[PDB]
Amino acid sequence: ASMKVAVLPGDGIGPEVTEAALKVLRALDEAEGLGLAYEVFPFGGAAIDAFGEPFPEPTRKGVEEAEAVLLGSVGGPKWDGLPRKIRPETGLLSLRKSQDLFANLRPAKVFPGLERLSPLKEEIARGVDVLIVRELTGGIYFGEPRGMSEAEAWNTERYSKPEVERVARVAFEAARKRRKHVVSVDKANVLEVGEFWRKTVEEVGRGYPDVALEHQYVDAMAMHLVRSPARFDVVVTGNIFGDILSDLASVLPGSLGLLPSASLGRGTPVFAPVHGSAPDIAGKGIANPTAAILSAAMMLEHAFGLVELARKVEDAVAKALLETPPPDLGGSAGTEAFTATVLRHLAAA
Amino acid sequence: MKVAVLPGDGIGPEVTEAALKVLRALDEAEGLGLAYEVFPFGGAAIDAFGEPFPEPTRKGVEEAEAVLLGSVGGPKWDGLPRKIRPETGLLSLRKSQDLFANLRPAKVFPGLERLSPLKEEIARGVDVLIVRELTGGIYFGEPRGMSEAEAWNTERYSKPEVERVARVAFEAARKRRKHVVSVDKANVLEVGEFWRKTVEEVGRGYPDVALEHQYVDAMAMHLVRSPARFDVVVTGNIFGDILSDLASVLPGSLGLLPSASLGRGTPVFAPVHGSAPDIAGKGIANPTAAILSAAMMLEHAFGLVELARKVEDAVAKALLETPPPDLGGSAGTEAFTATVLRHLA
Ligand SMILES: NC(=O)c1ccc[n+]([C@@H]2O[C@H](COP(=O)([O-])OP(=O)(O)OC[C@H]3O[C@@H](n4cnc5c(N)ncnc54)[C@H](O)[C@@H]3O)[C@@H](O)[C@H]2O)c1
Ligand SMILES: NC(=O)c1ccc[n+]([C@@H]2O[C@H](COP(=O)([O-])OP(=O)(O)OC[C@H]3O[C@@H](n4cnc5c(N)ncnc54)[C@H](O)[C@@H]3O)[C@@H](O)[C@H]2O)c1
Ligand SMILES: CC(C)[C@H](C(=O)O)[C@@H](O)C(=O)O
Ligand SMILES: CC(C)[C@H](C(=O)O)[C@@H](O)C(=O)O
Ligand SMILES: [K+]
Ligand SMILES: [Mn+2]
Ligand SMILES: [Mn+2]
């Protein structure tokens, strides 16, 4: 034991794609002597049914004591209509908030030679390599007042200066290690909170003169991200806009089953697919495990500094996608078979 | 046929003049008795009256039967504070006329599949109508404000605001393919939960219309991967704004998308697109959105359905024949407009 991991499989396809990532981690552990140890803990729907709440105390303790969390998606029709304070999705929010993981990193990269897998023509998809840095613990997701009566409902989009500054800082540090361009995304032409966001990111950027800074309104950014995506490096934005733009960015490599994420901040870092619990395909052994696998690759790199191992996983996934694509990308490889293709390539390298 | 023309800033006057030439040729051929006046709006109005929506412009709008609007904004006024900027005049126009229903159609015209960046088999038969709630939500909700330490805005909806925009979407679907998808973020936000429940209630009044829900992040992906499966898409102010820019990738360019804003007061017809300051002055701006917006005015404000269709057919032919630069072609604004007219005649 010198790599300590909390595994939180979730609901629907969550446990299916998470098991696939685990077989990749185990294969790497044995091949490399990583000294991996992990414990599995209930989370989401599975936790509501067993403990009455989505993020129970033994799961919080497992999270606190691990060096990293490999997380599966939560949610489904089974839990429709729960009091909000115990919904599977509120447990996910609590996870994020209790560890103060304010920086959500969502990369979208179109692998050379896989441009054809996109719904868009190859010239738009070619070369795409974008990093969305989404503010994860603030904005409308956590703001108060919030509630609902018979006549109306209300939620508050709000940000303070230090919340914007700390996410902006992460996006500049990231850009400095990439291609030194940040686009900051807001609705400053309509909303006081966008004006505030913009001005604060402008101030932070004065601390990073080596990084080019551009602003776009969220509606134009959505259009640009599908017409000119190759022209973007880092994209920094608030909680809700980052959620929308990151599901949108899946159309670049061509499916939502491809996109990984890392959530970083004060406590235990969390690695998880962008995608949800996909109840329409759960139980059919077809869910694309690429997001989960690449999330384990982000864990290797960011939580454990194992950059070269992360790159080997990524390359093994890109070859498996070219060779035996899963059904969401027009191919026939189920979860188990795709995962075996990834392992074969790993072992060959 | 009495019309207020509000040309706006950047490409706004350029594409608006193009739509006017189409309207004039139509007036002569058809004897519409068109009568229009031009009013200052946006930056052009800030510079001449110190405000983006001045009194003679409000009076022009009140007294017209329809407004043909040009886009507003640009770097020139970036240094004004928001509350007096060109975009706040747009919001005031909408609010004063209580135009709560914004109609933004995204169609791949039969034959123009090649113009879309989507593979042809994804783009075939795509015909989506976004119905966006225009006068409520975070755009207008109180409290809103800003201090040195923080800023806030309120995403707020009341039951009647949701019911009336839901009705409009159900009526529109009943005349189309009888499917509505309603979009929210009900899994995180009380206001989405409330939107969803109220749309469900209104839908019980339209058993001929199928009703589906999507969360806004999945909707954005589905609108690009499987656009052919949507008819009407109903949503709140900010989600509607984002989804409808995104929807431009279906026919192929933002410069193609028209809009109508309908409600209590004078109806407003205008491109989805903004003032495009990065191309203003170059004679290249695609005027299709402005021309198709004039077509929507003909249909929705004047009941001239077959004329609208004729405008739309001439645009489609011109697009196939002399495409503007945003669609991989070389036809500038004047030349593209001339192609439209030749097909009209
Ligand atoms: N981090 C999370 O736990 C997370 C994230 C998003 C949504 N959710 C929850 O998941 C449930 C489903 O919500 P949704 O449908 O809007 O989002 P979703 O991401 O689960 O699925 C959206 C679409 O993509 C497809 N898809 C998703 N992952 C895939 C994969 N790995 N392989 C192949 N296809 C895949 C799904 O079938 C569906 O068509 C809801 O209960 C929602 O609250 C959870
Ligand atoms: N209804 C409106 O008045 C309205 C709507 C949106 C934006 N705006 C304002 O427009 C200005 C620029 O905003 P923006 O860049 O975020 O969005 P935009 O819609 O003005 O331009 C977006 C992109 O698409 C291009 N584009 C837009 N219309 C085009 C056309 N007819 N032909 C060819 N290309 C076109 C532009 O060159 C730019 O690359 C800002 O001041 C903004 O507030 C106004
Ligand atoms: C399940 C929900 C809380 C979540 C979010 O909006 O953050 C999900 O959509 C995601 O993208 O991770
Ligand atoms: C300019 C702005 C106020 C407007 C909106 O967000 O409604 C524009 O983006 C649009 O899409 O019409
Ligand atoms: K650590
Ligand atoms: Mn999401
Ligand atoms: Mn817009």
PDB file of C-alpha atoms in Angstrom, chain B residues 17-197:
ATOM      1  CA  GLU B  17     -31.189  47.132 -45.604  1.00  0.00           C
ATOM      2  CA  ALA B  18     -30.967  43.821 -47.493  1.00  0.00           C
ATOM      3  CA  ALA B  19     -34.282  42.650 -45.968  1.00  0.00           C
ATOM      4  CA  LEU B  20     -35.831  46.033 -46.883  1.00  0.00           C
ATOM      5  CA  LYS B  21     -34.954  45.555 -50.561  1.00  0.00           C
ATOM      6  CA  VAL B  22     -36.675  42.199 -50.472  1.00  0.00           C
ATOM      7  CA  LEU B  23     -39.713  43.756 -48.740  1.00  0.00           C
ATOM      8  CA  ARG B  24     -39.804  46.611 -51.323  1.00  0.00           C
ATOM      9  CA  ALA B  25     -39.654  44.219 -54.338  1.00  0.00           C
ATOM     10  CA  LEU B  26     -42.466  42.237 -52.684  1.00  0.00           C
ATOM     11  CA  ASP B  27     -44.511  45.373 -52.093  1.00  0.00           C
ATOM     12  CA  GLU B  28     -44.327  46.304 -55.753  1.00  0.00           C
ATOM     13  CA  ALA B  29     -45.142  42.788 -57.134  1.00  0.00           C
ATOM     14  CA  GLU B  30     -47.915  42.150 -54.574  1.00  0.00           C
ATOM     15  CA  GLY B  31     -49.329  45.636 -53.730  1.00  0.00           C
ATOM     16  CA  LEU B  32     -48.881  45.231 -49.938  1.00  0.00           C
ATOM     17  CA  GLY B  33     -49.210  48.943 -49.180  1.00  0.00           C
ATOM     18  CA  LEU B  34     -46.008  48.798 -47.171  1.00  0.00           C
ATOM     19  CA  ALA B  35     -45.188  51.946 -45.147  1.00  0.00           C
ATOM     20  CA  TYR B  36     -42.110  52.046 -42.966  1.00  0.00           C
ATOM     21  CA  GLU B  37     -40.205  54.515 -40.794  1.00  0.00           C
ATOM     22  CA  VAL B  38     -36.621  54.194 -39.547  1.00  0.00           C
ATOM     23  CA  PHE B  39     -35.856  54.827 -35.907  1.00  0.00           C
ATOM     24  CA  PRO B  40     -32.631  55.063 -33.961  1.00  0.00           C
ATOM     25  CA  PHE B  41     -31.895  52.108 -31.654  1.00  0.00           C
ATOM     26  CA  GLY B  42     -28.896  50.736 -29.735  1.00  0.00           C
ATOM     27  CA  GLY B  43     -25.510  52.431 -30.018  1.00  0.00           C
ATOM     28  CA  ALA B  44     -26.725  54.625 -32.916  1.00  0.00           C
ATOM     29  CA  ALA B  45     -29.323  55.910 -30.431  1.00  0.00           C
ATOM     30  CA  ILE B  46     -26.936  56.304 -27.458  1.00  0.00           C
ATOM     31  CA  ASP B  47     -24.778  58.533 -29.690  1.00  0.00           C
ATOM     32  CA  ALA B  48     -27.718  60.689 -30.811  1.00  0.00           C
ATOM     33  CA  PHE B  49     -30.011  60.696 -27.726  1.00  0.00           C
ATOM     34  CA  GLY B  50     -27.833  59.421 -24.818  1.00  0.00           C
ATOM     35  CA  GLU B  51     -29.977  56.278 -24.416  1.00  0.00           C
ATOM     36  CA  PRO B  52     -30.419  53.041 -26.382  1.00  0.00           C
ATOM     37  CA  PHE B  53     -34.268  53.017 -26.485  1.00  0.00           C
ATOM     38  CA  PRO B  54     -35.314  56.732 -26.800  1.00  0.00           C
ATOM     39  CA  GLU B  55     -38.885  58.147 -26.668  1.00  0.00           C
ATOM     40  CA  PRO B  56     -39.491  58.650 -30.409  1.00  0.00           C
ATOM     41  CA  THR B  57     -38.272  55.050 -30.949  1.00  0.00           C
ATOM     42  CA  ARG B  58     -40.623  53.668 -28.235  1.00  0.00           C
ATOM     43  CA  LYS B  59     -43.506  55.642 -29.857  1.00  0.00           C
ATOM     44  CA  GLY B  60     -42.586  54.309 -33.326  1.00  0.00           C
ATOM     45  CA  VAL B  61     -42.693  50.745 -31.961  1.00  0.00           C
ATOM     46  CA  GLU B  62     -46.044  51.298 -30.080  1.00  0.00           C
ATOM     47  CA  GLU B  63     -47.693  52.619 -33.217  1.00  0.00           C
ATOM     48  CA  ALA B  64     -46.421  50.077 -35.727  1.00  0.00           C
ATOM     49  CA  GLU B  65     -48.056  46.757 -36.554  1.00  0.00           C
ATOM     50  CA  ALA B  66     -44.607  44.989 -36.537  1.00  0.00           C
ATOM     51  CA  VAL B  67     -40.949  45.808 -35.881  1.00  0.00           C
ATOM     52  CA  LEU B  68     -38.071  44.804 -38.142  1.00  0.00           C
ATOM     53  CA  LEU B  69     -35.058  44.926 -35.861  1.00  0.00           C
ATOM     54  CA  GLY B  70     -31.281  45.031 -36.468  1.00  0.00           C
ATOM     55  CA  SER B  71     -28.713  43.778 -33.946  1.00  0.00           C
ATOM     56  CA  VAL B  72     -27.037  46.194 -31.444  1.00  0.00           C
ATOM     57  CA  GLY B  73     -23.774  46.506 -29.533  1.00  0.00           C
ATOM     58  CA  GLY B  74     -20.048  46.743 -30.220  1.00  0.00           C
ATOM     59  CA  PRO B  75     -16.641  47.811 -28.752  1.00  0.00           C
ATOM     60  CA  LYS B  76     -17.562  51.459 -29.285  1.00  0.00           C
ATOM     61  CA  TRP B  77     -19.836  51.268 -26.198  1.00  0.00           C
ATOM     62  CA  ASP B  78     -18.014  48.513 -24.252  1.00  0.00           C
ATOM     63  CA  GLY B  79     -16.897  51.162 -21.752  1.00  0.00           C
ATOM     64  CA  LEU B  80     -20.449  52.225 -20.861  1.00  0.00           C
ATOM     65  CA  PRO B  81     -21.896  50.469 -17.846  1.00  0.00           C
ATOM     66  CA  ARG B  82     -24.297  47.663 -18.766  1.00  0.00           C
ATOM     67  CA  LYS B  83     -27.443  49.460 -17.493  1.00  0.00           C
ATOM     68  CA  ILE B  84     -27.242  52.012 -20.347  1.00  0.00           C
ATOM     69  CA  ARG B  85     -25.459  49.767 -22.967  1.00  0.00           C
ATOM     70  CA  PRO B  86     -27.043  48.874 -26.375  1.00  0.00           C
ATOM     71  CA  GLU B  87     -28.100  45.364 -25.099  1.00  0.00           C
ATOM     72  CA  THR B  88     -30.207  46.796 -22.228  1.00  0.00           C
ATOM     73  CA  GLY B  89     -32.271  48.713 -24.845  1.00  0.00           C
ATOM     74  CA  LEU B  90     -33.005  45.396 -26.519  1.00  0.00           C
ATOM     75  CA  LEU B  91     -34.114  43.948 -23.195  1.00  0.00           C
ATOM     76  CA  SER B  92     -36.294  47.078 -22.605  1.00  0.00           C
ATOM     77  CA  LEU B  93     -37.950  46.808 -26.033  1.00  0.00           C
ATOM     78  CA  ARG B  94     -38.863  43.192 -25.258  1.00  0.00           C
ATOM     79  CA  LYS B  95     -40.074  44.010 -21.742  1.00  0.00           C
ATOM     80  CA  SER B  96     -42.132  47.070 -22.717  1.00  0.00           C
ATOM     81  CA  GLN B  97     -43.974  45.072 -25.371  1.00  0.00           C
ATOM     82  CA  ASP B  98     -44.309  42.005 -23.139  1.00  0.00           C
ATOM     83  CA  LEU B  99     -42.992  39.819 -25.933  1.00  0.00           C
ATOM     84  CA  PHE B 100     -42.640  36.686 -23.750  1.00  0.00           C
ATOM     85  CA  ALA B 101     -42.574  34.106 -26.585  1.00  0.00           C
ATOM     86  CA  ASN B 102     -39.394  33.995 -28.661  1.00  0.00           C
ATOM     87  CA  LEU B 103     -39.659  31.680 -31.744  1.00  0.00           C
ATOM     88  CA  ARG B 104     -36.262  30.595 -33.208  1.00  0.00           C
ATOM     89  CA  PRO B 105     -36.591  27.989 -35.997  1.00  0.00           C
ATOM     90  CA  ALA B 106     -33.577  25.913 -37.091  1.00  0.00           C
ATOM     91  CA  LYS B 107     -34.372  24.017 -40.331  1.00  0.00           C
ATOM     92  CA  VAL B 108     -32.201  22.244 -42.918  1.00  0.00           C
ATOM     93  CA  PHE B 109     -34.032  23.234 -46.108  1.00  0.00           C
ATOM     94  CA  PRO B 110     -34.591  20.256 -48.485  1.00  0.00           C
ATOM     95  CA  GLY B 111     -31.471  20.438 -50.712  1.00  0.00           C
ATOM     96  CA  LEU B 112     -29.171  22.489 -48.470  1.00  0.00           C
ATOM     97  CA  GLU B 113     -27.875  19.494 -46.392  1.00  0.00           C
ATOM     98  CA  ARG B 114     -24.405  20.142 -47.823  1.00  0.00           C
ATOM     99  CA  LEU B 115     -24.369  23.589 -46.164  1.00  0.00           C
ATOM    100  CA  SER B 116     -24.446  22.021 -42.648  1.00  0.00           C
ATOM    101  CA  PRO B 117     -21.195  20.973 -40.913  1.00  0.00           C
ATOM    102  CA  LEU B 118     -23.149  17.864 -39.799  1.00  0.00           C
ATOM    103  CA  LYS B 119     -22.833  14.712 -41.929  1.00  0.00           C
ATOM    104  CA  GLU B 120     -25.579  14.774 -44.502  1.00  0.00           C
ATOM    105  CA  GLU B 121     -27.554  11.846 -42.976  1.00  0.00           C
ATOM    106  CA  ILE B 122     -27.688  13.599 -39.624  1.00  0.00           C
ATOM    107  CA  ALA B 123     -28.828  16.888 -41.236  1.00  0.00           C
ATOM    108  CA  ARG B 124     -31.537  15.449 -43.527  1.00  0.00           C
ATOM    109  CA  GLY B 125     -35.085  16.558 -42.566  1.00  0.00           C
ATOM    110  CA  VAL B 126     -33.962  18.565 -39.477  1.00  0.00           C
ATOM    111  CA  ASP B 127     -36.754  20.996 -38.535  1.00  0.00           C
ATOM    112  CA  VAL B 128     -36.604  22.322 -34.975  1.00  0.00           C
ATOM    113  CA  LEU B 129     -38.473  25.186 -33.358  1.00  0.00           C
ATOM    114  CA  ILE B 130     -37.078  26.661 -30.183  1.00  0.00           C
ATOM    115  CA  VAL B 131     -39.700  28.421 -28.042  1.00  0.00           C
ATOM    116  CA  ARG B 132     -37.763  30.485 -25.512  1.00  0.00           C
ATOM    117  CA  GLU B 133     -39.331  32.353 -22.648  1.00  0.00           C
ATOM    118  CA  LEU B 134     -38.284  35.945 -23.313  1.00  0.00           C
ATOM    119  CA  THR B 135     -39.418  38.193 -20.462  1.00  0.00           C
ATOM    120  CA  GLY B 136     -38.569  36.381 -17.232  1.00  0.00           C
ATOM    121  CA  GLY B 137     -35.972  34.168 -15.554  1.00  0.00           C
ATOM    122  CA  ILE B 138     -32.506  35.455 -14.633  1.00  0.00           C
ATOM    123  CA  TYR B 139     -32.614  38.184 -17.339  1.00  0.00           C
ATOM    124  CA  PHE B 140     -35.168  40.167 -15.366  1.00  0.00           C
ATOM    125  CA  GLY B 141     -35.373  38.616 -11.916  1.00  0.00           C
ATOM    126  CA  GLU B 142     -34.847  40.599  -8.644  1.00  0.00           C
ATOM    127  CA  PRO B 143     -32.805  40.778  -6.582  1.00  0.00           C
ATOM    128  CA  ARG B 144     -29.832  41.545  -8.847  1.00  0.00           C
ATOM    129  CA  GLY B 145     -26.726  43.601  -8.079  1.00  0.00           C
ATOM    130  CA  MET B 146     -23.032  43.946  -7.465  1.00  0.00           C
ATOM    131  CA  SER B 147     -20.603  45.106  -4.730  1.00  0.00           C
ATOM    132  CA  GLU B 148     -16.792  45.070  -4.581  1.00  0.00           C
ATOM    133  CA  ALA B 149     -16.955  41.706  -2.728  1.00  0.00           C
ATOM    134  CA  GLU B 150     -19.690  39.878  -4.811  1.00  0.00           C
ATOM    135  CA  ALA B 151     -22.448  39.967  -7.509  1.00  0.00           C
ATOM    136  CA  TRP B 152     -25.873  38.230  -7.690  1.00  0.00           C
ATOM    137  CA  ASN B 153     -28.800  37.578 -10.050  1.00  0.00           C
ATOM    138  CA  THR B 154     -31.994  35.710  -9.504  1.00  0.00           C
ATOM    139  CA  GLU B 155     -33.371  32.937 -11.646  1.00  0.00           C
ATOM    140  CA  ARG B 156     -37.052  33.309 -10.788  1.00  0.00           C
ATOM    141  CA  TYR B 157     -40.268  32.122 -12.520  1.00  0.00           C
ATOM    142  CA  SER B 158     -43.883  32.349 -11.475  1.00  0.00           C
ATOM    143  CA  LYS B 159     -46.590  29.823 -12.421  1.00  0.00           C
ATOM    144  CA  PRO B 160     -48.363  32.117 -15.002  1.00  0.00           C
ATOM    145  CA  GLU B 161     -45.022  32.996 -16.769  1.00  0.00           C
ATOM    146  CA  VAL B 162     -44.299  29.304 -17.304  1.00  0.00           C
ATOM    147  CA  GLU B 163     -47.896  28.454 -18.233  1.00  0.00           C
ATOM    148  CA  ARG B 164     -48.120  31.054 -20.950  1.00  0.00           C
ATOM    149  CA  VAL B 165     -44.824  30.125 -22.688  1.00  0.00           C
ATOM    150  CA  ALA B 166     -45.738  26.381 -22.317  1.00  0.00           C
ATOM    151  CA  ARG B 167     -49.097  27.064 -24.022  1.00  0.00           C
ATOM    152  CA  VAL B 168     -47.367  28.730 -26.955  1.00  0.00           C
ATOM    153  CA  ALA B 169     -45.079  25.679 -27.365  1.00  0.00           C
ATOM    154  CA  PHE B 170     -48.004  23.211 -27.198  1.00  0.00           C
ATOM    155  CA  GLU B 171     -49.987  25.245 -29.772  1.00  0.00           C
ATOM    156  CA  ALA B 172     -46.976  25.388 -32.023  1.00  0.00           C
ATOM    157  CA  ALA B 173     -46.389  21.633 -31.703  1.00  0.00           C
ATOM    158  CA  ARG B 174     -50.065  20.906 -32.460  1.00  0.00           C
ATOM    159  CA  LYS B 175     -49.550  22.610 -35.824  1.00  0.00           C
ATOM    160  CA  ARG B 176     -46.251  20.764 -36.395  1.00  0.00           C
ATOM    161  CA  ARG B 177     -45.261  17.198 -35.396  1.00  0.00           C
ATOM    162  CA  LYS B 178     -46.946  17.096 -32.006  1.00  0.00           C
ATOM    163  CA  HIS B 179     -43.746  16.607 -29.925  1.00  0.00           C
ATOM    164  CA  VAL B 180     -42.423  18.965 -27.264  1.00  0.00           C
ATOM    165  CA  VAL B 181     -39.156  18.581 -25.354  1.00  0.00           C
ATOM    166  CA  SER B 182     -38.941  20.812 -22.307  1.00  0.00           C
ATOM    167  CA  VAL B 183     -35.453  21.626 -21.031  1.00  0.00           C
ATOM    168  CA  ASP B 184     -34.349  22.472 -17.496  1.00  0.00           C
ATOM    169  CA  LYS B 185     -31.863  21.611 -14.825  1.00  0.00           C
ATOM    170  CA  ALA B 186     -34.454  20.096 -12.466  1.00  0.00           C
ATOM    171  CA  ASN B 187     -31.837  17.715 -10.889  1.00  0.00           C
ATOM    172  CA  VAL B 188     -29.934  20.705  -9.364  1.00  0.00           C
ATOM    173  CA  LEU B 189     -32.364  23.654  -9.294  1.00  0.00           C
ATOM    174  CA  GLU B 190     -35.719  24.238  -7.586  1.00  0.00           C
ATOM    175  CA  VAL B 191     -36.619  26.476 -10.535  1.00  0.00           C
ATOM    176  CA  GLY B 192     -36.105  23.554 -12.958  1.00  0.00           C
ATOM    177  CA  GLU B 193     -38.246  21.254 -10.800  1.00  0.00           C
ATOM    178  CA  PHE B 194     -41.012  23.912 -10.801  1.00  0.00           C
ATOM    179  CA  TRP B 195     -40.632  24.542 -14.550  1.00  0.00           C
ATOM    180  CA  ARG B 196     -40.902  20.825 -15.232  1.00  0.00           C
ATOM    181  CA  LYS B 197     -44.005  20.274 -13.014  1.00  0.00           C
TER     182      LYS B 197
END
